[PDB]
Nucleic acid binder design. Structure first.
Ligand SMILES: [Mg+2]
Ligand SMILES: [Mg+2]
Ligand SMILES: [Mg+2]
Ligand SMILES: [Mg+2]
Ligand SMILES: [Mg+2]
Ligand SMILES: [Mg+2]
Ligand SMILES: [Mg+2]
Ligand SMILES: [Mg+2]
Ligand SMILES: [Mg+2]
Ligand SMILES: [Mg+2]
Ligand SMILES: [Mg+2]
Lengths: 249, 72, 96, 242, 145, 99, 143, 136, 87
RNA sequence: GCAGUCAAGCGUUCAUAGCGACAUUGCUUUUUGAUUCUUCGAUGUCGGCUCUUCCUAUCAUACCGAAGCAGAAUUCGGUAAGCGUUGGAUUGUUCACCCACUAAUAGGGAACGUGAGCUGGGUUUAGACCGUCGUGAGACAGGUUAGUUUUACCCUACUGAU
RNA sequence: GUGGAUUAACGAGAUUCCCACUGUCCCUAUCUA
């Protein structure tokens, strides 16, 4: 939502997505048509198949395109933390590919329904339905790599802690030997283990406590090594963006 | 729970006591189980299973040929 | 074609045929199962239905909204004079 | 100051009545609510497990202090006999013939002063003065007409609903002779009288009441030893941050 | 056309018969029925002389209403008083059977306490329970003096 | 914009009584309340807590509590009696009074 | 019932009660409150021209004048005369709360009776003074 | 599902089908309420949903304040006028159908309720009981 | 948005409550001609104006009740006919 | 669908005459989730009322399996037809689409069940008007109005009764 | 290409809304020849 994103439903790969939508069409529509029926019955049969497959793909895409957060419509701190964790151009480009594939599926649906309006036989209508479903399948097969990337980023972003940028906040900072994590273990309750090697905490953790009947946060820091401006990894980028963005103590 | 916590619980507490033997027995039963699904499944699921089996067999023989040719 | 508006069936098909009974005295088709260590007991009685009336009871039922409250209920009165024993019949279990 | 629940609701004032010398609990379900009261109180005062008019809303239908108890006309004589049998003779029980049958909604009393609804008959006001032995005053609560539901009052101080004005607080505290503050209860409810019971040595609230609300009502009701009711000047940083 | 207290469609083309489940007209009532789980509220004796009284009523009366049971008469014997409705009409023969299984409900385990039994007239709108109560409410009449 | 913007003023300020009379009115605590040992839920010393009787006499919706078991009467054989409540066409409570 | 009394005395067509109108006709402040009504869109004369005995609203003031002259109004005025028959009369007729009903009767013949009659007299002369030279057409201007 | 109601509700005769006008009994600014749906009603072919005393409905405001109109809101029925049965035995009815405006969590929008309130509604809803001065 | 309130200046399509169009016109008018074509006797709130127009056009109900919808439809029909200044 | 690289079987032992399963890339961007007020719908002999059965290609309810499945809430699968699957609005009508309520508002068959069980509209004419065409009589499946099929007591089936 | 365009009253002419009123309906029951 605003502070936490454990509400994106799920995404699937391209092959499993194709299996889901096409088997759903085959199960939930009727499958028995005859050459001796009327041509309006035959056209309505194949038109229903085309429309149902298109709407299933559009619904599966539209669930994702509203599930994933807008990177340019959130807080600056959350935007910078998400930008460090996963690359912003890869993020925007993958969701743009999802949106374009959605619009192309609606185009295929409309054009082939209009072409099914004038079919004269079961053979002709069957070839038209097969061509429409094959074009949709080719689009979804071209969507392979953004779906795998989006699956990884959803699985990672679900676990992420909930920092309110506009509340009472104690930030801790220092060199890579424990210090800070042991102090957070003392003042709060958490799971940040204390260990004598340097980069034990490769992320940032939140604890909560109560002083004078107010609720305080306390954010732990991985550690900034020694480096000037552009030699740093995303691990140190997390800490310096937390300090740069969190109006805290 | 914060940043990735299931593997921290695994490192702090352990897995189940009967965890490893169950996985070994599952992998041992899978050989009998894939032939039971080739003979019991009917309809469309049988055709889908046969397509997946053909794809897996071609992929495995391609891996064997490519490995022996590249190493030798 | 299908019905397009589902509805449950009108009436119970296990109470067929809706025909007249074979007597005024309805027959007992099952008795409680015998327990050969309990004392000797009769398992039914027969009487005459004589009207209805209304009572008030003081209700004790823990967990309900009418716990420790007064409730008006309808009751039925059955006139039961004593019954008089005149015979005995024995039954053998046959594979029919 | 403790926090309980009736079943899963925080309206303690709806289902309970608490004064200096007796407690009244609504029956129903289990013994958890009665046992919370008995755990906090003991055998020091009688706790009576009763109903009024067949209903469970017994804090909003009855009204009483240290001296007396008032039940509406909708109560039955079996319930009134049960109450007389359970309570001792030092507290007198009167049944009132009054149109406004929610007595706990229309009066707000302690052992000395009672505020009432303005549209209460003269026979009823004379009966309140006779049975409860208090000084009666017709008054609204910042325009609200249900003084028992929108104010919570004891012998030490008083808490009113949070959109009460400062001059209303001044006039009402002069009439009531107690320090009076405005606040919320059960995480921001304006109905402060029907979500919290209180006497001179106890206050019971709901589980959703926050710690600033708890500290403010402990201060204004002078409950703990470290609560001199002027500690809002040292507790002001919590309130300005809140 | 041709009435409205009817079933409109009683069958289709196939099967070319009326089926056994398609709701025709015929006999209603006079069927044999078994109904279970009726609680016994009072077992009354025929010589108690106050078997219509409770421990909250303190009046000497029997269960016979004021004027008799309509189409039946007085009771004058032992009686069973059960809760609710029973199949059949008045003055018909009923068989009462014991419970065929052990019931695990609390309703079969409670203990009923009657507070009052109505004995006003059911032939009309009765509003007196005893004829002495009717005579005491009305007072003395022209034939009484 | 307002005076510590307006939703703090009637809450952070305490209204004072400003006495108008010479009636002394004090809080009252019955001394049995001051003579309590405090209940402590993790001790063997505990009082009884009727929740316990309800636990060992069935469940929550199974235990049936006697409300006549805490009456204050002159005699103790009187605690399980019942009022007659009706005699002929009259209510006993209409006639019940001393003298 | 049949059809007439079902059409007239239905619960959604219920009219005000005599003892409520008696308490209205006592207490001169309530008479002033009932005469000085506010504007209301759902009343016939915009909440004005109201008869207290027959608790109904008139269209114009000339309608109130002819109603006050009529014979239905005299029937209601004759109905609203003595002790107004509350539940206390039914209780004391059964032989219950009899002293309370007797206190009520002597109180209504001592105090509330002549007050109601004096208010009714003042109200009659006030209405006869006001409804004298009134035009038949009405200004729709509600101010 | 049944949100805000403390406990269970026993069966009471339903008086108000979908398409009825009832009064507004609080001082929120409305005059009447038009019933368009009933929360927690069954499904049956041809049967209208119907509300009784103590139920939450979805209503619109037809007469009253200009801000309250043209929007759908929850309401609670507090007076019925169709006769129902008390379990201590008498049948009884009110003079009119009437309800109050509420949020989906059961809390009330107004500050006081005019006229009497059925004790079943007041026992089922605690925020209705805290805002009413006359309970039957 | 109010597509029907935009189209209501054009010939009327299926209006059920004209009391959204009536304050729209009351914002979209100069006072110098409305008080002439209607002879408004005072306060120019929409409710009081619709009340005097119902009692003036004779749009009453059984009892003497001003019907508000019919008379606001009469004002909207006056706007359709074109007896109010507009541009 | 078109174009290219493959490479197990192949041309009943030939690889490159000539195929060629499984793959793999290209081609279809208001190419950084942008625009797109759109229902780009289909449908002309059926639609509605009433009522009963059957299929499983399972929406809900029962029991299981997998998933970065903490809890809660979901997603994807397996068995399974015992049981349910609504009230309205709206364009000629229906589907689709909206508004709710709901555990859920699954999909189909029975002469596209039920055109001499009943009904709006057609089959189905004759009166009249407008538009277009024709010198004209007239025509138009272009538009709008008004318009006659009317058993059962027979045999069987079914429901009850001797 | 400048019979055409309006029209009060009248109509067993055609279409759409409102108030009143109701067994049209929820959801049926009872009575007379
Ligand atoms: Mg179906
Ligand atoms: Mg048998
Ligand atoms: Mg009778
Ligand atoms: Mg299956
Ligand atoms: Mg079935
Ligand atoms: Mg529903
Ligand atoms: Mg048909
Ligand atoms: Mg037919
Ligand atoms: Mg023709
Ligand atoms: Mg004709
Ligand atoms: Mg000419």
């Amino acid at each position: 939502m605003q502070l936490s994103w454990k509400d994106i439903p799920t995404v699937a790969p391209a092959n499993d997505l194709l299996d889901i939508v096409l088997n759903r069409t085959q199960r939930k529509t009727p499958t028995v048509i005859r050459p001796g029926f009327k041509i309006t019955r035959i056209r309505a049969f194949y038109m229903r198949k085309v429309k149902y497959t298109g709407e299933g793909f559009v619904e599966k895409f539209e669930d994702i395109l509203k599930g994933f957060p807008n990177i340019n419509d959130v807080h600056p701190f959350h935007r910078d933390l998400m930008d460090t964790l996963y690359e912003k151009n890869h993020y925007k480009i993958s969701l743009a590919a999802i949106s374009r594939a959605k619009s192309l599926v609606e185009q295929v649906a409309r054009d082939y329904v209009r072409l099914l309006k004038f079919g004269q036989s079961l053979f002709q209508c069957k070839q038209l339905k097969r061509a429409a479903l094959g074009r949709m399948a080719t689009i979804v097969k071209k969507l392979r790599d953004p779906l795998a990337y989006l699956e990884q980023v959803r699985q990672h972003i679900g676990r992420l802690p909930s920092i309110d940028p506009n509340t009472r906040t104690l930030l801790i900072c220092g060199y890579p030997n424990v210090g800070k994590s042991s102090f957070l273990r003392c003042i709060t309750k958490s799971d940040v283990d204390v260990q004598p090697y340097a980069f034990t905490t490769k992320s940032l953790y939140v604890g909560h406590f109560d002083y004078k009947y107010l609720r305080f946060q306390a954010i732990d820091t991985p550690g900034i090594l020694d480096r000037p401006t552009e030699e740093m990894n995303n691990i140190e980028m997390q800490s310096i963006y937390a300090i740069a963005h969190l109006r805290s103590c | 729970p914060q940043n990735d916590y299931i593997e921290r619980h695994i490192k702090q507490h352990g897995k189940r006591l009967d965890h490893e033997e169950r996985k070994r027995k599952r992998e041992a039963r899978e050989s009998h189980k894939i032939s039971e699904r080739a003979q019991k499944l009917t309809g469309w699921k049988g055709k889908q299973f046969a397509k997946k089996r053909y794809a897996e067999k071609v992929s495995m023989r391609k891996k064997i040929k490519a490995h022996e040719q590249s190493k030798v | 074609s299908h019905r397009k508006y589902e509805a449950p069936r009108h009436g119970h098909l296990g109470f067929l045929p809706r025909k007249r009974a074979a007597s005024i005295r309805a027959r007992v088709k099952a008795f409680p199962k015998d327990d050969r260590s309990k004392p000797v007991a009769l398992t039914s009685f027969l009487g005459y239905k004589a009207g209805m009336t209304t009572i008030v009871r003081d209700l004790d039922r823990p967990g309900s909204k009418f716990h420790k409250r007064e409730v008006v209920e309808a009751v039925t009165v059955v006139d039961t004079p004593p019954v008089v024993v005149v015979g005995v019949v024995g039954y053998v279990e046959t594979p029919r | 100051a403790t926090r309980t629940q009736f079943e899963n609701s925080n309206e303690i004032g709806v289902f309970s009545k608490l004064t200096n010398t007796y407690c009244l609990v609504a029956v129903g379900g289990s013994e958890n609510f009665y046992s919370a009261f008995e755990a906090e109180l003991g055998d020091a005062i009688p706790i009576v497990h009763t109903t009024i008019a067949g209903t469970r809303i017994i804090g909003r239908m009855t009204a009483g202090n240290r001296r007396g108890l008032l039940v509406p006309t909708q109560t039955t004589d079996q319930e009134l006999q049960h109450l007389r049998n359970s309570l001792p003779d030092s507290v007198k029980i009167q049944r009132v013939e009054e149109r406004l049958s929610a007595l706990g909604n229309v009066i707000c009393c302690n052992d000395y002063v009672a505020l009432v609804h303005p549209d209460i008959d003269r026979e009823t006001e004379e009966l309140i003065s006779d049975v409860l032995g208090v000084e009666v005053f017709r008054q609204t609560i910042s325009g609200n007409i249900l003084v028992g539901s929108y104010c919570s009052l004891s012998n030490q101080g008083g808490l009113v609903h949070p959109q009460t004005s400062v001059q209303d607080q001044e006039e009402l505290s002069s009439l009531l002779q107690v320090p009076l503050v405005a606040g919320t209860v059960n995480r921001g409810s304006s109905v402060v009288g029907a979500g919290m019971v209180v006497n001179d040595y106890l206050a019971v609230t709901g589980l959703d009441t926050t710690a600033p609300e708890l500290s403010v009502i402990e201060s204004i009701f002078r409950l703990q030893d470290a609560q001199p009711e002027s500690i809002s000047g040292n507790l002001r940083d919590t309130l300005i941050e809140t | 056309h041709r009435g409205l207290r009817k079933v409109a469609c009683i069958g289709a083309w196939h099967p070319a018969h009326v089926m056994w489940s398609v709701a025709r007209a015929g006999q209603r009532g006079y069927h044999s029925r078994t109904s279970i789980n009726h609680k016994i509220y009072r077992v009354g004796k025929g010589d108690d002389e106050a078997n219509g009284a409770t421990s909250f009523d303190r009046t000497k009366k029997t269960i016979t209403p004021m004027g008799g049971f309509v189409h039946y008469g007085e009771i004058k014997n032992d009686f069973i008083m059960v809760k609710g409705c029973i199949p059949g009409n008045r003055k018909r023969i009923v068989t009462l059977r014991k419970s065929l299984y052990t019931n695990t409900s609390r309703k079969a385990l409670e203990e009923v306490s009657l507070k009052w039994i109505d004995t006003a007239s059911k032939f009309g709108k009765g509003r007196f329970q005893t004829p002495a109560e009717k005579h005491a409410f009305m007072g003395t009449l022209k034939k009484d003096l | 914009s307002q005076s510590r913007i307006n939703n703090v003023l009637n809450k952070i300020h305490v209204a004072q009584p400003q006495a108008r009379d010479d009636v002394k009115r004090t809080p009252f605590i019955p001394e049995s309340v001051k003579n309590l040992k405090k209940y402590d839920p993790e001790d063997p010393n505990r009082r009884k807590l009727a929740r316990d009787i309800e636990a060992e006499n069935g469940g929550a919706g199974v235990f049936n509590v006697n409300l006549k078991d805490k009456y204050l009467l002159e005699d103790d054989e009187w605690k399980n009696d019942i009022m007659p409540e009706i005699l002929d066409g009259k209510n006993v409570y209409d006639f019940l009074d001393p003298e | 019932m049949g059809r007439y009394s079902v059409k007239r005395y239905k619960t959604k067509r219920r009219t005000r009660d005599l003892d409520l109108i008696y308490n209205d006709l006592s207490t001169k402040e309530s008479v002033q409150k009932l005469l000085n009504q506010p504007l209301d869109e759902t009343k016939p004369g915009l909440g004005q021209h109201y008869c207290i005995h027959c608790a109904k609203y008139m269209e114009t003031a000339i309608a109130l004048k002819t109603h006050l002259k009529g014979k239905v109004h005299k029937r209601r005025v004759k109905e609203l005369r003595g002790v107004p028959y509350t539940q206390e009369v039914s209780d004391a007729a059964a032989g219950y709360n009899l002293n309370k009903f007797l206190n009520r009767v002597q109180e209504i013949t001592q105090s509330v009776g002549p007050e109601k009659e004096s208010n009714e007299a003042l109200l009659k002369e006030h209405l006869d003074s006001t409804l004298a030279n009134v035009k038949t057409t009405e200004p729709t201007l509600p101010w | 599902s049944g949100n805000g109601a403390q406990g269970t509700k026993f069966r009471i005769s339903l008086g108000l089908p979908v398409g009825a006008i009832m009064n507004c009994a609080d001082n929120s600014g409305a005059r009447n309420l038009y019933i368009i749906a009933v929360k927690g009603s069954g499904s049956r072919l041809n049967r209208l949903p119907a509300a009784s005393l103590g139920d939450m409905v979805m209503a619109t405001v037809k007469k009253g304040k200009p801000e309250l109109r043209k929007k759908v809101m929850p309401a609670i029925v507090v007076r019925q006028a169709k006769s129902w049965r008390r379990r201590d035995g008498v049948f009884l009815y009110f003079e009119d159908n009437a309800g109050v405006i509420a949020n989906p969590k059961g809390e009330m929008k107004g500050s006081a309720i005019t006229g009497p309130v059925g004790k079943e509604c007041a026992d089922l809803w605690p925020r209705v009981a805290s805002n009413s001065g006359v309970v039957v | 948005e109010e597509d029907i309130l935009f189209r209501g200046v054009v010939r009327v399509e299926h209006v059920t409550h004209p009391e959204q169009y009536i304050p729209g016109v009351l914002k979209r008018c100069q006072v110098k001609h409305l008080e002439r074509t209607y002879e408004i006797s005072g306060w120019k709130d929409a409710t009081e104006f619709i009340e005097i127009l119902a009692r003036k056009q004779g749009r009453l109900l059984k009892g003497g009740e001003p019907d508000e919808s019919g008379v606001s439809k009469q004002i909207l029909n006056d706007f359709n006919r074109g007896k109010i200044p507009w541009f």
